[PDB]
Amino acid sequence: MADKFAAKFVSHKISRTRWRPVSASSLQQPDVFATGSWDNEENKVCVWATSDFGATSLDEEYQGDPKQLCDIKHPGDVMDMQFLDKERIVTGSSTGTVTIFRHHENNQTLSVNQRWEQAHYHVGSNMRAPCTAIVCSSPEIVSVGEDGRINCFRAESRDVLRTIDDADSSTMHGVTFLRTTEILTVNSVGQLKLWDLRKQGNDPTQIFSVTGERVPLHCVDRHPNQQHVVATGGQDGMLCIWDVRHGKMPMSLLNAHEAEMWEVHFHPSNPDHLFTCSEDGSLWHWDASADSEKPTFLLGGRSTFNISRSSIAPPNANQSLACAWLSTDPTKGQLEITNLLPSSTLSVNSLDVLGQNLVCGTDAEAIYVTRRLFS
Amino acid sequence: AELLKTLAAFGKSPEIAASLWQSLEYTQILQTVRATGLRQGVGIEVELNEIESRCEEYPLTRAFCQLISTLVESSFPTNLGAGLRAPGFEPYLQFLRDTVFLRYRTRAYRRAAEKWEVAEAVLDVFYKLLKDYEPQPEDFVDQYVELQGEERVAFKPPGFSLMHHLLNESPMLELCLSLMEEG
Amino acid sequence: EYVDALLGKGHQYFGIQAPLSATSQLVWFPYSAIDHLRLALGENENNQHNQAILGKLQRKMDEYFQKLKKATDDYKKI
Amino acid sequence: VGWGPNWTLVHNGDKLSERLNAEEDRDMDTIDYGFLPKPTSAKSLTESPFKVHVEKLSLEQKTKDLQSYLLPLEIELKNSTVDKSGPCPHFRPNPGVTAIHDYAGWVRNFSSEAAEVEAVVKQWGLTWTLCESLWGQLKELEASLDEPNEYVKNLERRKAFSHWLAQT
Amino acid sequence: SHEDMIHDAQMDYYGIRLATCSSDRSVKIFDVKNGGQILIADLRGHDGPVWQVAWAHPMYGNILASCSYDRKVIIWKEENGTWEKTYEYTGHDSSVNSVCWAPHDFGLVLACGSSDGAISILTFTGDGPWEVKKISNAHTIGCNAVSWAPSVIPGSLVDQPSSQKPNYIKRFVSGGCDNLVKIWREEDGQWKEDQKLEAHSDWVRDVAWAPSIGLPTSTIASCSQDGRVYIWTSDDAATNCWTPKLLHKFNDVVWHVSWSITANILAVSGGDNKVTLWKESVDGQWACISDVNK
């Protein structure tokens, strides 16, 4: 790691942040990013330029203050922003009007374009149950939520295109990729549904009662090593790792305690680095969730002490047993946790760990940036 | 906060409390969502997330809590809104279950007494609410609306929902354990 | 009940006297009320009660239109 | 809609008043919010506009026309003559080309001072100069003397029209 | 406000007071200042919906004779900024249409357009009784709209200065469901016809005379069921002549053809869901330069 003691005072909350569609690279990140904030000055989406790059950029050392480029107000609340092609910004709204901009990638200016409306449908009265998760297949956009509706659109579209409403109206929560056309969805009931853009094939019949419960999950992402390997974290208290290629198959179940599993994130280069931002607890970074066990990482956690300036790796010598990703049986706890809190009561709401550059947007009117987390 | 406590002391009387409750339901300080409306919109939530977080002091939360507590104590919400709404404490209950008892002690604070005062006020308001509420035997029937095709969801009472939540798995036990450990 | 009493003769209890003569086209019929009723029916159409109310309203409207056409023809024949 | 001083449409029902670049979901911020959470749970299934507003609808939208409206009348006030007929007074303009000459001269002077008016105003000024060269007295008549020839007058007005075309 | 069924509001001669005859069995009066408006007066005493209230004159006195349903008209009076009832006239079988006032030198006579197959005229001096006269035997069906003539003699004629005296003779027009359009003239107690025309092939819906405040030009705009908008303009001297000029081949039933304060601009409102200000240019005929919502 490389956590210092300097911390700037920037009163700017952050809810989510999207970047430019980087190709042939996952660790490197651009310097300009579209931040959909919860409430900087109000509910809107802004554009911020800094110096975020892969493997720690040269210019701008610790504590880098971003600069605002263009601000465009967004009606509703931002919950999902994904880049379709190259110059497309799709943002979901809580009011039911998913906005789409064809902003200029070089002019640093957002252009108001189109809006997909009509997301709440009910006969008799009106219930606000829009779509929460938004995925992009290029050039296809699929929106789902806790309503059972599946909204499918293609490139350059202003109205609705496909409104799938099957008899199995579940309550979808999170979405994840599999390759180039297969997408898995974790619902808010404890089931998984994997489909392929060629033909919709729903199958939410994977109930687990022994060795792993099926409490409604929340977030889901993919492992840096092997794109098919996924990891899902929710209210079950178990960061369930799966080796799904076309069928639901688990592998590791780490019984997490004193957490909520709201937003999971992985670190590239070294895939044995996973973070989980939640609302039940302070700041802590896991180091033995998907992988086996990495020594020299305790003596911290929650809000006591701190372990930084060193990322000790397990010793590699002449072994006789296999040691890899294996952590089943939901009976463990918090193995190898790295404390990221500077022993101060703070309330964070967003933490993006895209590479070695961590960016933490908190509600305490402050900013946190770490240039290196593995050395 | 000064205007909030002034309005509470005004509504200390029953008639003034009813008038203030009607005015509050008609003006909508908190984005009460039962059928439509922007959730977490501009208002008290945005204020307490912006200026309260900037000043590291949260008196507005305690003021709103004591105001709604006094209003409920002096006049029960028998009819929400003027004549274009319906009685329902569901949005306020959801707000108190999401914001309160989750982010009220481990936030940006510069004084140790702020968390203690916030916890004391929240616990007193909750105790007063649960003491004023009384579960009736008529709350066990299927409360399904069936008036000219008004097929709605099971509009459970807020007190009954809170009792069911406290009976099942709830973080209130962990919060009480943490408060006892801090004490 | 009001429109039934008006079509019959029971408006004496409601307070309205005899209808105005030489007014076979339109006397006093608040169309905004029936518009709001039709909107509410179209918005809350669900159970069989809505279908029954719609059928009763259609029958009443057909009868009222027939009576109004007969009255207009009788007034124009003179 | 209502009515007012002739061409002045006030508000009464539904109309298209003055437009302003401030609608919701536009470029460079500019957003708004309506009464969304007002009807909750039970309500009246009927939508209708609420409240009213007293606005104005005009068509000029110009604050520099005061001079263009006052200066011609300011020059007309010199040529005007009071008639004093009946109770209220009466006014009648004097028939003479000196008024048009003064109009053209003042227009050309204002143009040479600050040509910031409109193309239509410049066209009206050039038409005034053409009318002065045609019907009105020519500068050649004062430049020369003792020349009562219709052919000379025709040549003078022809060369004046040529000079006007060259100036245009 | 917009939540009610407002027919046509009215404004004070100065332009600071507004009055709406809402469908709430009452008449509201606001005082518009700066930007926002404030409701001050709420006159209650109109049975049923209120049609429209016409203004009087500042030099003669503020009088707002309201006309509502249930066959009744209410004349009020203002003192110390407060309005109060002072006269009520009822006693009709068919529903009364609308009412109108007289211009400046024409006087202050209220025309009660009743569809009882007759005409009811209410003359008021200033602070005394009200002379109610009834001209019976009109035609088959009751009247629909009524309008008056300018203060001077009918016919646009250039008069000499200090040589024209506006007489007190009455001239009016009444249009109803009779496929025709007439014009009555009286010498303070002798109503008689003036001219007859047979050009309308459908039921005449409404008519409106335009007493121009600046010229004695007599022009009557009529509207029927099909949409035959004929502009009967009389621009001669002292006689009577109407030319049927079809303005626009409409396909609706126009019920209102209001005129501006100078009776030069015409505002049409009917079954077209729009309002097109077909103003009169500086060369006669018509020209549509503005179109707004209904």
PDB file of C-alpha atoms in Angstrom, chain B residues 35 67 145:
ATOM      1  CA  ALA B  35     -47.690   6.293  -5.098  1.00  0.00           C
ATOM      2  CA  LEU B  67     -41.198  18.195  16.116  1.00  0.00           C
ATOM      3  CA  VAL B 145     -58.282  -2.663  -0.627  1.00  0.00           C
TER       4      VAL B 145
END
